[model samples]
Target chain A: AEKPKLHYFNARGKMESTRWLLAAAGVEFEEKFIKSAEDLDKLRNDGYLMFQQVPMVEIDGMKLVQTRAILNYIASKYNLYGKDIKERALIDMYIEGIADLGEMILLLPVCPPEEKDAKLALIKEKIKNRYFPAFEKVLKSHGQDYLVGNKLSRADIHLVELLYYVEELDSSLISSFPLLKALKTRISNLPTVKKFLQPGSPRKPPMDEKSLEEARKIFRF
Target chain B: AEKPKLHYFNARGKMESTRWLLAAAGVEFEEKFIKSAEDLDKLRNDGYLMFQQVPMVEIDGMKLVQTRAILNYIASKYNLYGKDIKERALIDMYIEGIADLGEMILLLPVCPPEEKDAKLALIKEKIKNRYFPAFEKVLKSHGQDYLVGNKLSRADIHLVELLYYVEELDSSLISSFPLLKALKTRISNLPTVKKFLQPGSPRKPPMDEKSLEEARKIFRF
Candidate 1:
């Protein structure tokens, strides 16, 4: 078998969590970045993407699309999902919340210039008041090392990525949630995650003006 | 064990799919509609909703939130997900595509009065030109009765529901997709689904001014 190949823009639009998940699971993978409109057109023309969308991954001799579907397959295959059906339910709930927060962060880069500051502030407020408080309560209630079944499931990995994104927005945002702050340290120090956080990894940085332009050109946003 | 208890607005917002899934699974469940602000406030005060969001369900001694989470639990429990991990991945992909279309339809009811016609036209155009063709090709490529694994799965159930929603929008919207048209007939005739399509069931009518006003009051949307 070959390393899984990811197809997406050169930025971490929706595929960043997938990269983080694969990295946390100790799976080495490659990427085929969509660098131009022609590149995206060719892929669409060839019919590799199922829904004519990117964040598609070529894995185990199959072309998979849909961000959540790809993530679910990887998590289930690599044992990052919970141990049983009930555990999976809780994990799914946590990940959905995190996905909502992730969506807010994903939208920050594309905000119109005039609305950027207010949108960023609103996202921060929501994270502090709405999203983080909920997860903080969950971690506090269970008093567990991880979110579900006390194991390193996809929920934990995904939350850690969002935690970093929040920190990038405002580091103090996590100060009120002690458990999440500690979780940021805990998951980041894991061997696989620690390696990925090192100087050279497939993980893309927060979107900048240049990469945003590249993404716009390829995705036509 | 008790049947699951769903909490949502009287109208079919996010929770409608949950009702459809439970109904399709032959599981008799009850609903606790949020008739007023007090109802929603109480649910939040009781700490039932994980994200303080609607479409919460109490099942198996747990309070589950998130629409996808609820639907996933129901489908997995009823053996409607898929046969194996691989099949589940394909089912997930198909359901995600259906979900994209569902999101477009969900926005139609909330469109501003002046833009409603244009928005509706755009949605109809996208359905015909983009979404329907993708699924039609998938159905033809596999020549399968169901969307995945040639067996009934969550994807088939979800697609059937969307087919009904589209038929309501424009009966002729489906005329071009023969496989989808046939699959709609095939799935709709199933004992459980047929029962759901009948009168006197909990199935909701298309949003009307009265229900829409009620939903606005209940959901503040």
Candidate 2:
């Protein structure tokens, strides 16, 4: 079987979560890093990046663009999506909020130093006052280990991914929400996810200024 | 059966796409407009607006937020999503780009007057050079009646919806893309979509300055 080839910058901008999802599924994938504008333009010129965007994935004889599309395909193919329509709908809803928060977290690295502290504080406030409480409510109300069904799903993986990223922002981020704290522990301990959290895994470190500058040169952003 | 309840401001902010999809599905739904800040907060307080956001819909005995989640649920329930994973993946990929352009279009009404003309020009340029041509390529390459499958899917419906909106920006917007223009005509003549295009239908007109002020008062953004 051919391994899926991920094409993106070395940093964990948008592609990291995709990496997390694939890792959680125990799928081995190869990366074709876009090192320069030329590399990116080549992908676009060759019609590989459908929307002329990175995070384009080559898998199952198709070149898929759009992060959600790629993730949805992988999740459904790997049985990480929920059992049926309603369950998938719930997973989709939860993941949307999770992904929104992820977008906010992704903004921190590129933020100028002067604004970084305020941005982190705002992110922390949102996590404490809005997002974490909402997830805690879902976990409590559903009485399920996972967000949608009895089994693990992409929603849980994505939330756990954000938990680690946010935890790095502040070690005590989840202290107030016992339910979410428990959910994070539950999802993080899965063998595949545990492997991803380990030392030698391909999971990316938090983006630093050097990596951000490198990405800027590559993306011209 | 109880009709689905849509809660949003009267203007077509985020909920219009949902309306278009529901109408295209031949499903009747009712609206609960959030006329003021109190109305929005009341929904949030009562736990109806999950994630404390609008464009929330109550359908199938469940309340849903997140525009894509709402659209996905409706598309799946109405059999407008594609038949299987691959088809659905393609549909998702197409919809994501369409939705991204929709976000840009939504920004126009809120853009300050001094910057409005420049914003419009940028949007027009992006549409002509990027978005519209991309969708046109899909239609031309696939040679299908719809985007992802043989029949009408949500991608087609959403594309048709955007085509109309973009056309209002400039009547000749699709002039260079015959394939897209033809596809738009194909989708627009569908009985449900045709009905929604009529004057008396529930579809909201373009957001005017007055409507934008009203929305600003309600959302304070």
Candidate 3:
């Protein structure tokens, strides 16, 4: 069977998650970059554009939008999603929950300082009170090894990535939640994932320690 | 295969879209209702709960959360989602876009009367100008038949249901967009969709003439 050709507007924002999923699945495809407005316009004129958003995945000349949807499609095909019904649902919960948190962090760059402070305060409160507790419940219910089942799934990878991203965005974000921090470290230390974190694997970013520290000030609780 | 069982909370809010998708796909499922907080609490305790939200779908004891994710899953399995990648992206765009609008309307019940005027005004000026025009562009590009593929998709069904729900909530909310009205009428005329729109079919509370008139006041250009 011919391998599916994947074309996406090059952005490392939400599409990063999809790219990681594909990478973990060992699927190879053509990666194209459309960076500027002109590039986007060209893609649109050529009928290659799927939506106003970037990171669209096109398979066999067909395109799928929504990062989570694309991730699910790839995961289903790769058998990395889950083993059964409940597992898949657990995967969805963890992935989407992280996604919800990710959306909050995404706002920090654009929101005004005061508004960002208020929003981040609410976010940390919810994360600690609501999201972290939920994660704790899951870990307690299942084992500490994985979020859902025994094997590594997209949720584990995503949660680790999410925590890493959040910590980079604000170091103190995870300091209060030790179990989650440990989970992040555990997932990141996986052989495959560890390799991805090496110097040249597209996973490293210049740490903006000062900015992260400033952001961490809002999380004091 | 045994018929899939769906455990839907009694509220017909976000879950309505999923129910319609299942109906369109001709899939059978047990629709269990949790009408009160006690029932919801019990479901949560029993691990029957899926997400923090309602409308959790359990297929053979596996639960799926997020209405759009569940819709896409059902559509993919039933082949009613979209025929190809491009069509699927279009479907996602329409579904997510309409869902965004639905979320905006959800604020109506809680917005203070004085604040409602400003918020409603913004919806008319900004949302209609920005978002609705985007939808209009897609409609015109597709020649007014369907949103994505040449055939009806889950996206089309969802848009139709959204239009109906919006009309019932306040017909005036949609009065300014003739294209939307035409599209809604076209969708309502579909045989299967129309059958589901009959009196007993699950749908939002119908808007009375007074409500429509009052709603129209908010959208006045």
Candidate 4:
């Protein structure tokens, strides 16, 4: 395989799922970091991204941007998307649902610093009343092993991250939803994902509680 | 086949892509317009949307929400996604790209009437400097036939809609990109798509242009 390079900022925000995916695939790829304005300017001038955003990937002789597209491209290549067209579409639906969750989680949104506590409070309410229950029901309906196709897909990996995202903020958050907790355990137990989560991975970022929340609000999402 | 119900506010925002897919599939779907405050309230009250957004589709015996998921679900059912596993994932990548474009378009952003011109100017700059060239290169590289596989897919159909969306904002904007112009024509000429674009379909709504621009900025994308 002509190994790919995954490019993103120094955060686990949008590109985290793809990291888990690459780890699960046991793929050897490089992470190209953007730590400053000059680095981002290089990406924009190099035509890697039209939007001047990160999470763009270079592999298989194509430079792809857009987090969802990059994730799906890697997932499809790694056989983590789905087994067939219908399953992939189902997987896409699940993936989009996670994205919608991401928008709500705007766990970190760019807002006046003072609005953060209020936003986190709202996010918590939304998690309990909206996101978690719907996901729990889907898990129950489809079996707790994965989100769709009754097997591991990118959606499952994203869910694993999303669960961590929530729990990192509020430990008691997902406790009421046993199915979700079980799904998280099942996903975290994956050898590759487990290894990636051991330490120092972006997936295992320090959740100082206040900073993760404060940082999350930086998205302006 | 089951007749799907395409639900959304009374505008051709994100829902239009799925509308095009259903048309390409020669499927008949009811246009359930949530064009009023009361109807929207009812939709939220009915729990039709977990995130409480529209462009939801009720079909395949499931009330699917999230624009990308709804479109993908419809596309998969009608084989508009792609022909196979890799093809489907490629289509997903393409679809996500479109969603990213939609976010930029903000079909509607929360701006006052006075700031409309500024928003439109920024949108125009984005289209010219970024989106069009990327698509133009894709078209030129692929022989200008279709996006993704050589066969027609939902991505091509969405491109057709996206072009029209841009043209609605500024008609002469897309005239420069010959390949995109040709692709739009090619897609518009597809028999199913052709029939769908006739005088009766929602695709050809009255364009006051003024109100449409202001209306598009309302979405929270």
Candidate 5:
């Protein structure tokens, strides 16, 4: 079978989950960078992108966009998404929960300095009240190893990626949830995951460099 | 099989498409409305809400949050998501596109009255250049019948609801895209969809009513 090619920006953002999935599966896929307006236009004009967005994955002669969709596709094929409809829906909930934070993280770099404090405050509050407690609940209810079926589903992996930005945004974000702390430690220490989160893997972008904490400080050009 | 219960606000907000799916499937389900802030507090206290947000669906004894996940789960079970993985990814891409627009509309009510003009201007510009044209491309290229396959998918359903708002915001949204306008008429007029969209079908709420256009105007209190 031919290898799938992923087309997106060089920096790891939403697409990073797919990269992690591919690496975990030991799949050899091509990566193309869409770094500028010119690059994006060329992809659109050349007919490579019909939907007019980046972070597209071309597999088996199809170009799939949408971060969660791509992550699900990779996970389904690689056996990391979930086992059944019940498990998949739970996985989807966790995935979408993190997506909210992912959106905020994406906005942080471009958010005006005047708005950053308010935005960050809003983010931290949600993490504290909503996300942290919910994940903590999942851990306690299902067992501390993984998010669903006591197995390693994609949500567990994705949560770790999201937490980096959370911790970077505020060091104290996860302290209230002990299991989340343990879960973070458990997932990030995976041999593949450990390698993926190392310096220069793009936990944060250059323009968004202000106030980046421990999780994002290693990012480099 | 037991019916799936939908937990969300009385409004259409994010749960409209899922409600449409449930109605289309001709299945009986429970509707738990969060009509007031106090209601939300009790629901949050119940702890089934994984994301601590509404638009949750419970089926086969599993309660699921995240709008798209619930949508996908219903579509997959009812054979409406896509024909296969290739088609599923395309469907997902379209769904995410609608979701981006959905996020924008969600901001309308909460947006500070002072900054409405600038924010509204930015949203309109995106609708004109990015959202409409890209969808126009999809309508023209993909057979004008459905978004992905000849069969209906959740993405097509979402497009109809989203276009209602865009048209309300700017009637010209679908004017330039003749096929999309036709597509809107085609899907909206589907027998099942038509009945489900009747006055007070839980798709639109009273307070969120700012400027619903032709399709939404039919909404009854």
Candidate 6:
């Protein structure tokens, strides 16, 4: 049987999470890099590029779009979608939460320096006041190492990866949230993730020195 | 087992979608109407509501926030999720698509009458130029009956309900797209859904008039 062909733009923004999912699932596919929006436009108008988004997967001439949809697809296929109904919902909840956070973080690089401080402050407040408490409740409810259950689900992997990115973007962001910090640490130490995070792995570099300085100025770190 | 409790303000907004999902699934819960932002304030301060949104569900003392998260929770629990991997992804894709559309429609109610025409035009351009074509491909790929597969998943129900809402909001807005009209008709005719569409169903309400008028002016029909 021919292997499925996956064409994802070479970007760490939204596509990276999908890549991690495919990697964790051991799914085989080709990764194509389209460096610019112009290239993306050509591909999207070709009548075969699925939706106007990256991380599109083509299986037997069928194209699937949307990052979360693709992740759910891969997870469901590999039985990584949690063990039962409640567990699956728990997984979905975690994925959506991570997605909400991802949207907030994506704004960081694009916002002007003057207004970035207020945005980051809002992000910090959301993480500290909203997300942390929800996650703590989840951990308390499950009492397991993984987010959904005893085993690693896609939600666990996605959350850990996102949290790692957030930490890299701004370490002090996790300072007040010990449970989230512990969760990140737990997932990072996993044998698979630990090996993947080794020196040679692709590390997501900060946007730019100017942006970093601006971020530091805004975040007071 | 104890019944779950849902807390929300107003008739139905984001939370209504979840309510529809639960109702379709035949799940029963207590729906509490929170009168105002003051009620929300109290709930947040009491630690009963951690998120800054409504339509939150508390299942056995654990509260679940976020509309999509809550919908997935009910769908998974009721086996309304698609049967297979690809089906599941397609379901997510459809749900997310409708959700993206919903965000656009949400702006209609808030935009001033003077600005409504330009805004609606922009929205229609997006739908016609982007969403309609993409959805047509989905329908063509899956064939006539359903969005995912033969069964009725939450994604199907969601798109159907959204389409109904949009049509009632302004039939002319969707008349240009025949495929959408057909898809909407098919979804509305579903055995379960057809029952709900009966004239006196408790959930029925006259469509938002001002928003519809805005849509008509914007679409220039």
Where does model 2 exceed 4 Å of error?
A: A112-118, B112-117
Q: Tens digits of per-residue lDDT for model 2 on A1-221?
A: 89999989887888998999999999999999887888988988998877788789999999999999999999999999889989988888889999888898887777788999888888888888889989999889978898878788999999989888888878787998888888889888989989988998889987777777878887766
Query: What is the per-residue lDDT of model 4 for residues B44-91, given as tens digits with 9 covering 90 to 100?
Result: 888887556777788766777777777666776677767765576566
The pairs that clash in candidate 3 are A62-B85, A63-B85, A63-B86
DockQ value of candidate 6: 0.50
Kindly report which residue pairs in candidate 1 clash with one another.
Answer: none
Q: Which candidate is the best by DockQ?
A: 2
Displacement of the residue B124 alpha carbon in candidate 3, Å: 6.2
TM per candidate? 0.97, 0.96, 0.69, 0.84, 0.84, 0.82
Looking at model 5, what is the TM-score of chain A? Answer: 0.85
Q: How much of the true A–B contact set does each candidate keep?
A: 0.68, 0.73, 0.15, 0.52, 0.58, 0.67
DockQ-based CAPRI category assigned to the predicted complex of candidate 1: medium
Residues A1-221 of candidate 5 have per-residue lDDT tens digits of 87888887666666777887776566777788765567777887887765567778898777787786787678888888777777787888788888877888776765778998898788878788877888888789867588888888888877887787787677887887888889889888787777666885433353335433321433221
Q: For candidate 1, lDDT tens digit of each residue in B1-221?
A: 58889998887788888899899889999988788889888998998887878889999988999988888888999999898888888888888988988998987888898999898888898889878998899899989898888888888889989999999989999998999999999999999999999999989987888878877877767
Per-residue alpha-carbon lDDT of model 6 for A60-165, expressed as tens digits?
4458777778777778777888887677766766677778888888767777889999988888787777776777777777677777778888887888777877
For each candidate, the alpha-carbon lDDT, in order, equals: 0.89, 0.88, 0.65, 0.73, 0.74, 0.70
Q: Chain A TM-score for model 2, please? A: 0.95
Worst 10-residue stretch by lDDT in candidate 4 chain B? B212-221
All candidates: DockQ: 0.79, 0.80, 0.23, 0.44, 0.55, 0.50
Name the regions of candidate 3 deviating beyond 4 angstroms: A1-12, A27-47, A57-59, A83-87, A139-145, A169-183, A204-221, B1-12, B25-51, B57-59, B62-64, B72-79, B82-94, B104-153, B165-192, B206-221
Judged by TM-score relative to the true structure, which candidate is superior, 5 or 6?
5
Q: In model 6, which residue pairs have backbone atoms overlapping below 3 Å?
A: none
Clashes (N, CA, C under 3 Å) per candidate: 0, 0, 3, 16, 0, 0
Q: Candidates ranked by lDDT, best first?
A: 1, 2, 5, 4, 6, 3
lDDT of 6 at A93: 65
Candidate 1's residue-wise lDDT over A84-134, tens digit each?
A: 889999999989999988898888888798999998888888888889999
